[PDB]
Amino acid sequence: EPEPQMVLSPLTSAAIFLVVTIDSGGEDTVRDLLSDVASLERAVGFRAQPDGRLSCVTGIGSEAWDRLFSGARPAGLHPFRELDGPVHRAVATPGDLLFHIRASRLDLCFALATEIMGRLRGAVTPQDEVHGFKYFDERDMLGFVDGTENPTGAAARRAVLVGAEDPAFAGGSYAVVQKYLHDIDAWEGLSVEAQERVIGRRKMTDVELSDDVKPADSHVALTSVTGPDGSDLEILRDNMPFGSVGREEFGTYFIGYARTPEVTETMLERMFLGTASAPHDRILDFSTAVTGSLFFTPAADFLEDL
Amino acid sequence: EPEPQMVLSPLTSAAIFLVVTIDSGGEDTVRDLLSDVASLERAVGFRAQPDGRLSCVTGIGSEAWDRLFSGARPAGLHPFRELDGPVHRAVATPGDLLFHIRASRLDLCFALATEIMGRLRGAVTPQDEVHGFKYFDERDMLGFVDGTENPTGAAARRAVLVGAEDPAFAGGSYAVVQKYLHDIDAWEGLSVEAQERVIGRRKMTDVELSDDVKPADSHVALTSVTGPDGSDLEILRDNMPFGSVGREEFGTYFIGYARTPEVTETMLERMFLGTASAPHDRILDFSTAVTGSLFFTPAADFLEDL
Amino acid sequence: EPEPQMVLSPLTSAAIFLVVTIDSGGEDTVRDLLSDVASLERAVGFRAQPDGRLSCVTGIGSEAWDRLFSGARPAGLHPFRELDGPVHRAVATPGDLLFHIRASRLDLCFALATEIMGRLRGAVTPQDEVHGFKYFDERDMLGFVDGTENPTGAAARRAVLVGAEDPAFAGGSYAVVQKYLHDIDAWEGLSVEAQERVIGRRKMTDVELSDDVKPADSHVALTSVTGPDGSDLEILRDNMPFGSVGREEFGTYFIGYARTPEVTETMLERMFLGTASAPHDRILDFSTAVTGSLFFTPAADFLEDL
Amino acid sequence: PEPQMVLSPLTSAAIFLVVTIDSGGEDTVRDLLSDVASLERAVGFRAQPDGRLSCVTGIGSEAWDRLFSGARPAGLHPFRELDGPVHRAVATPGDLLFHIRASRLDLCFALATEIMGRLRGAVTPQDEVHGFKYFDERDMLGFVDGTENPTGAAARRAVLVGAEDPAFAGGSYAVVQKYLHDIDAWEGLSVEAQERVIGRRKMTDVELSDDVKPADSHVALTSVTGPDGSDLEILRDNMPFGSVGREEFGTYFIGYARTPEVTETMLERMFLGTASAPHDRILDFSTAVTGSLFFTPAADFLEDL
Amino acid sequence: EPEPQMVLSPLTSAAIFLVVTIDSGGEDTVRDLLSDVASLERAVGFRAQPDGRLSCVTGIGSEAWDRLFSGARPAGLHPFRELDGPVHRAVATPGDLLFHIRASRLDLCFALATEIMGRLRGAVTPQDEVHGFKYFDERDMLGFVDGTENPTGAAARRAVLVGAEDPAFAGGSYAVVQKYLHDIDAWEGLSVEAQERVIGRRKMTDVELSDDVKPADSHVALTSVTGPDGSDLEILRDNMPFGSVGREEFGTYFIGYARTPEVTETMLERMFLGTASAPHDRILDFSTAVTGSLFFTPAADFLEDL
Amino acid sequence: EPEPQMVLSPLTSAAIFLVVTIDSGGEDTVRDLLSDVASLERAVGFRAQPDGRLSCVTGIGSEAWDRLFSGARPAGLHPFRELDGPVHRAVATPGDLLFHIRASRLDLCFALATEIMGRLRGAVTPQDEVHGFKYFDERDMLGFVDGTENPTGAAARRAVLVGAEDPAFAGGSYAVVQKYLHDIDAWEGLSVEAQERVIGRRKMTDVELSDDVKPADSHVALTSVTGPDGSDLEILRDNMPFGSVGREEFGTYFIGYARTPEVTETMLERMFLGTASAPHDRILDFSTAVTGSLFFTPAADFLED
Ligand code: HEM
Ligand code: HEM
Ligand code: HEM
Ligand code: HEM
Ligand SMILES: [Mg+2]
Ligand SMILES: [Mg+2]
Numbered sequence A, B, C, E: 001e002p003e004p005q006m007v008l009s010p011l012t013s014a015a016i017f018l019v020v021t022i023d024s025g026g027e028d029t030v031r032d033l034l035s036d037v038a039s040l041e042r043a044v045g046f047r048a049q050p051d052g053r054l055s056c057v058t059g060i061g062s063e064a065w066d067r068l069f070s071g072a073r074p075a076g077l078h079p080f081r082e083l084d085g086p087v088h089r090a091v092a093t094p095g096d097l098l099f100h101i102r103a104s105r106l107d108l109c110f111a112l113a114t115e116i117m118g119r120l121r122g123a124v125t126p127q128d129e130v131h132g133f134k135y136f137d138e139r140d141m142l143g144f145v146d147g148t149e150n151p152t153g154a155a156a157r158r159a160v161l162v163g164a165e166d167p168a169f170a171g172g173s174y175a176v177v178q179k180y181l182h183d184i185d186a187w188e189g190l191s192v193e194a195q196e197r198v199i200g201r202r203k204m205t206d207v208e209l210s211d212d213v214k215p216a217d218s219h220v221a222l223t224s225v226t227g228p229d230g231s232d233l234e235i236l237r238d239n240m241p242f243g244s245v246g247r248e249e250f251g252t253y254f255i256g257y258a259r260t261p262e263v264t265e266t267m268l269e270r271m272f273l274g275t276a277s278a279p280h281d282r283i284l285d286f287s288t289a290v291t292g293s294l295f296f297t298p299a300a301d302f303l304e305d306l
Numbered sequence D: 001p002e003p004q005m006v007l008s009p010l011t012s013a014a015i016f017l018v019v020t021i022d023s024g025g026e027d028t029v030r031d032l033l034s035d036v037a038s039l040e041r042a043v044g045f046r047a048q049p050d051g052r053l054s055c056v057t058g059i060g061s062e063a064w065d066r067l068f069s070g071a072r073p074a075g076l077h078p079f080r081e082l083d084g085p086v087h088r089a090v091a092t093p094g095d096l097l098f099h100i101r102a103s104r105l106d107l108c109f110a111l112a113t114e115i116m117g118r119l120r121g122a123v124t125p126q127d128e129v130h131g132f133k134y135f136d137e138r139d140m141l142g143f144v145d146g147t148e149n150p151t152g153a154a155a156r157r158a159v160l161v162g163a164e165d166p167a168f169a170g171g172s173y174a175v176v177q178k179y180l181h182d183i184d185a186w187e188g189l190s191v192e193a194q195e196r197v198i199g200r201r202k203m204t205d206v207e208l209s210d211d212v213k214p215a216d217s218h219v220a221l222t223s224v225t226g227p228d229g230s231d232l233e234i235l236r237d238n239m240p241f242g243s244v245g246r247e248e249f250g251t252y253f254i255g256y257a258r259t260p261e262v263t264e265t266m267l268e269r270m271f272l273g274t275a276s277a278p279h280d281r282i283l284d285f286s287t288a289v290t291g292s293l294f295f296t297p298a299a300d301f302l303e304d305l
Numbered sequence F: 001e002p003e004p005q006m007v008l009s010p011l012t013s014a015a016i017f018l019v020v021t022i023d024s025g026g027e028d029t030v031r032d033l034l035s036d037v038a039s040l041e042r043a044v045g046f047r048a049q050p051d052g053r054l055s056c057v058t059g060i061g062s063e064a065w066d067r068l069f070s071g072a073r074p075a076g077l078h079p080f081r082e083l084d085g086p087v088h089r090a091v092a093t094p095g096d097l098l099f100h101i102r103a104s105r106l107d108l109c110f111a112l113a114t115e116i117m118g119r120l121r122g123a124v125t126p127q128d129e130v131h132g133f134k135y136f137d138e139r140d141m142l143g144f145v146d147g148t149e150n151p152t153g154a155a156a157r158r159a160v161l162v163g164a165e166d167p168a169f170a171g172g173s174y175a176v177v178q179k180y181l182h183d184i185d186a187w188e189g190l191s192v193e194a195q196e197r198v199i200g201r202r203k204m205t206d207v208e209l210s211d212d213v214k215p216a217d218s219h220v221a222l223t224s225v226t227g228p229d230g231s232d233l234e235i236l237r238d239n240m241p242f243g244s245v246g247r248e249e250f251g252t253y254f255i256g257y258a259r260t261p262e263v264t265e266t267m268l269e270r271m272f273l274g275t276a277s278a279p280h281d282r283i284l285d286f287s288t289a290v291t292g293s294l295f296f297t298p299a300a301d302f303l304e305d
């Protein structure tokens, strides 16, 4: 069976997200680093075992893939698609490589990010760096519990990992990232009951609103999608708050993994373009996307052997 | 005793340092916030007891003191004094208020910073915001253990808290802050033995170099000061690493507390201006100060009663 | 393919056992709740991950099964069989649903019980509610370590989960519950050596008595059974102390899971009715059963699909 | 004089045990009082330092006069019933209180077992509640409970008898009330309406500002200043308890103070109201079913019996 | 106040006891080490804060004192006194320096012992080295909880620290050490009830036997001493199991601290020589002392100032 | 289907290594103990769950195998082979049984060792007993992080457990032990950069030296082996510091598990006898082997019958 990267991580309370572009002439430096990234993860993480829980998931974009590798492409790999909705826009922003670094402490994240970027100096240009922290009750910046309905165990493996449908790339996954900034002043002007109608769950107790009260333009309603067979199509999310109080930046860094980007893209279309029953996802009236990128995260074997 | 602020905190692995200036006309809003800052610390922190260990130490600058308060001044309060050394310079930068927020996790720090700045919107201008994290074995960004010779218990209390020498302000302290950025490329070009000669301690085991090998221009040699009495003059430090990998910013946020600023200032003069046997502290050949401010941190009761 | 409930839970230090009967006309309300119980476990539990270790195992009795479902019954499902021994009696008491709620803290158990019962009030009548706690170093109220010879890993899965012998119900299990009250005054009148002879293991060190000295009417001797094939027949137990000091109630809540009730029932026959060499299990001279019920705990997907 | 462990660290489990002393049980009770600290160490030591087991023992007014002779604590009297226009604070029997706290219920239970084992035949149980911390220091109404308790020296000064009653210095006065909540009614309010009842924000536990906090909120009525301008404070360690099958959801209130006058003033304001408030709105969702007052002596008083 | 050494340590589960004699000419090397031992404790321990709980208490014997220092002697310092009882003997063995090193883990103790002995190589001869480990429920090698009636807080300070009675040495203490080996086969041949009679407390529950049933020759009876003043005379103990299974060595390392050796010496006389009602402490019928030494542990400032 | 011993343990910070020989006539006592050793592991360890992490791996040597059992032998079981290198020597020393006892605390290790040896008194002679302790940041006595490149998960199972190649013994493993003593004075005389050249990794950050700067006689270079197919051959190690400051003994107790001893033996030959590019492993210039033994650790089911 092929060994995936640590897409299915334990719960972690710190993350660094690093998105870079590859400069002209930097391909070979990048390739050497890809073949060492797992050993750097162990070097930095081992001595903090077992509670460190350091992992790094490395992703490669569509245009970058063609620069770095020849042969087969993953079937679902394409550039992030801009969505120009009637009201809200999901922008596409440049990104060749993603490093999704997670641990139980920010310092381990930082130490590994330092080693990675030290090897890439002069070959890449940083496009985004976010230092994320979880709130202590798994809450996000809007004050709701964030992650509750993620799949677990076998159902998670089936939702996130490429299998026999693209056998050369089995054990990989597709990651979509978007950095969101929130209008907290507007959000805090809503009553709790109104906020619950935006999200689709109760705020304090995290119980889902019943089908007869949950609005069609709530976040939970629009991101619930069923496949041909009547079964739910699922993604795995690990959204992280971030911010700066002096600049009034209060953010959610969205990351979602799926076996095929189509699932994630369907959810995004429903959110931003709307449906017959819903103009758009009401969460977007308090949340603005400022980045958007899609990456393929190969199996760990693929990175080692190259 | 009067009740001090939580200057002598347990070890905490996260901090936010927030420095602001008070805008014209902002004084009343600031005074209201000062009288409520202890209750905001409890509101954010109590529910995370006992692990959260959230505390906020609030400091007031010399010029701000004059704008905010009627009567007598703490004896040692003055603006930070610039040191113009033959090679290195300690700059003075603006700062009216300091919020030194510490906890076992960054989210609690952020939540308290958000509430404080929410109340001060419109009355203050942010000057500096640093999100600090401790490395896992109390190391700083230069790879050395940082904190080892801090005083503890009664010796700490005696070194840090104003007493009978200034009885109206008993239970306060004086905080000096400087944000330092490091030249990591240069530092990593030294051998370990050369780095040990700069600091004055062994890198891996943190054992002090013996008196016959410790250079006169090492950091430990220059920041060891004896008073008239033959006794050691001590400060309490809680230096925090910070940075950004993409911008190549690797930093130490220095903060030192003492019962009189003279102790801290003597150490700084020795570092920047040197002595008979040392041109300057060798740590400054790898460290540039980009801020410098001095604050008085009053007793908790002083702030409550406004 | 089939996902069991969390029968094989990590060690947890708190539990709630809830046994109810279904009132006339309550079947529809019960069926709606069964399809949502996994959702409620996530809503309460997710925000306390990963330490909370909250789970709910839901079991259905023989008579209730026929009221709720039509089509196939699990092969082994029948009402608990009363054992009328010459001295000791194992009573059968009413029970249609079992909720076996476990966590590392009681509040999570209570919160989930509250949500379940909130949905069912008006449809069910409570018959028993016990709040269990871990007592020292995995000890029970008799002062002996309790759980030592439980199977683990693969052997646990094979002992507890229905497989190919009843393929429509694969991934389920059978739970037997009995609430026992102890005569502590009588028990504490025995010497430690005499107590060890009752149980069959050493009290302080939990070392099993050798074959030469272990009495045939000890608890360990009577609950050790080999099948026709020479191999040990095993169950999985998660007995919990409970009590009330003012009422002088000191109890053990017995729960045992097995892939077929015949294993558990054989152990019970040996305990209450005896063998050629042993009149009854000596533990029963200090322990009285006041409830007795048998439940089938279906695979998690069986409940989801209602 | 060494106080009992009235000022405990935060603990997540408690047992509250209230008993009456049967006719003729006085001598058995006195022997147990002189050993209770030894039993606390015997049960607790092996779980140190995380166990944080402690037992505070209190004695009621009528019981005091049966057990001891000579001078009595200045403020010791039976709990005073409050018969308000709407709400009533009842007085219920109780001679001895054992307030047992730890980081785990088993330690509490083990110590309660040893204490009651020694008292068998001399006392009759009146109340037994097994309390648990609920999430992030929340109570059964879903609000953080404990936030404005005093700490450190301010706590010592609010709770321990001193020079005002020198023979009993180092003691304290405990008031207990068991409350049951009408959760269905409470959950019918919006969050904003619940915040108006309590006087703080629900999710963030920030106090409402003085211009929106109602005069009949819980925080408004239990804030009291003395003649000299300073806050009169008590130390509380309220614990949730309940039973899901009986629909019983409760708060076990316990408040310590250096004189019962402080606690009693707060209770009068809650139950009988003020010029601007008919009663504490929390009582529209909360019914007291017990009420007792105890003196908790200095530890050396108990040792020397 | 003077600063005492860490005689009153938190509970620690590992220890190293080192006893050495000072060779001919070794005094200067020893004096240098004594003035640095507090800084070695910080160097090894600080980076393992807060869990490490590393400390070192350094003690000096009667003969050694006169070689190392001139001026005043502590009033109670003398060589350990052999007690030649009718049956049992408390032996005296050589020792000039004691290092009592404690932590939550053996490796930290070892690291500090390595640095100390590294500095003393060539100046001292090792006499004893014991690596001690506590059992997980504070039990000793005999299976009883060990530590229960130690004083705590103010009562401990008053029992252990020299004060105004010898003001030049205020903040010091006196340590007695004895290494005991046990006859485990004999001990394990007793019933639990018989063992309880030897100790004076219940084995499982650690409740003291009542005055009416506790034998006069039990350990607890003989080590309970009242002074002329009516009050209990107390010491602070931190006994540690040690051993080697291959050599059949199972031991208790006794260490007891007191403000004057007379308290400890009185207890030893009662144990070894007996009383009117007791021939000797019954624990000695299962325990043989093979070392015996007495040390003065000075205040920390005394050592720093050399 | 066959249940291995706890060869793949979580990280543990304490260990006891116990090596014994079986005396003449002691075979029956040993066989009885082997059938009970897993139940002793549970008796001592269950009550210390979940933090205790106590396990015992039991190994049997080649000559002992023939005394205890007849029928099939594991295919790879033979006595440890002495290596007489031009400079350094790997000695073979006697040992019939190995008990590799691990936990989060030394007391649990000792408690289990006591029970095991209690049952074997009179039947065995101890040859070695080592009480190991890991440093807090997974460092060894040389100050380097130790364990970093061990395999994990499925790669560990595939490297360590006997499978279809020897189906009667599937689920077993082969353990090689060597006790090393270090010359710490010589080691501490090297600069950090020189130490890094001996090991092959950076000391502070544990990052491997790049291929173009890593010396051919570094420890990491010589213990990296590829098989016929070009894939890496791996072992699982759990090296433990030990020592005595008074006797100036500072040691590493090496234990390596592998599905066949050939892998471990190839690494040893490279270390002691060298290659075309390297006279020997530079770590041996600071480390002397004073024991050497090889054991088969059967599947747990094999011992239970
Ligand atoms: C500002 C950005 C976002 C915030 C603050 C946010 C927050 C939340 C919250 C609070 C929940 C409910 C609890 C749970 O995690 O199950 C949730 C659910 C969900 N969100 Fe988001 N979300 C964001 C963006 C997105 C995006 C961009 C997508 C998809 C492309 C997405 C997909 C989901 C899905 C699939 C669920 C689960 C729904 C279900 O099956 O119940 N989220 N989100
Ligand atoms: C770039 C900024 C700095 C870095 C990275 C740094 C780092 C260190 C390190 C590694 C030590 C040795 C371990 C310890 O005792 O903490 C130390 C000690 C010390 N530093 Fe700094 N330091 C900085 C700035 C300062 C400044 C600006 C002051 C004074 C104004 C200062 C005062 C001290 C003192 C008093 C000590 C302890 C000396 C003693 O052993 O008695 N440091 N520092
Ligand atoms: C008063 C109620 C009970 C108490 C206090 C109790 C207590 C114990 C104790 C102390 C042990 C020894 C350690 C271990 O758990 O392995 C044990 C073992 C066991 N008990 Fe119970 N038990 C009770 C009722 C029952 C019942 C009703 C059954 C089965 C119907 C049962 C089945 C077992 C089994 C199978 C074992 C393990 C035997 C073996 O060593 O293989 N127990 N029990
Ligand atoms: C003499 C004492 C020994 C010490 C102190 C020691 C120490 C180390 C250290 C520090 C490392 C690097 C970090 C790691 O991956 O664990 C290492 C790696 C390793 N050691 Fe040892 N070692 C010793 C003996 C041995 C022996 C005897 C063998 C084999 C027969 C061996 C096999 C290995 C292997 C295979 C690696 C992994 C190399 C790789 O692929 O990176 N070691 N050892
Ligand atoms: Mg009903
Ligand atoms: Mg109701």
Ligand SMILES: [O]
Pocket: A237, A239
């Ligand atoms: O999400």
Ligand SMILES: [O]
Pocket: B237, B239
């Ligand atoms: O510093």
Ligand SMILES: [O]
Pocket: C237, C239
């Ligand atoms: O059991």
Ligand SMILES: [O]
Pocket: D236, D238
């Ligand atoms: O309260």
Ligand SMILES: [O]
Pocket: E237, E239
């Ligand atoms: O002792």
Ligand SMILES: [O]
Pocket: F237, F239
């Ligand atoms: O190794």
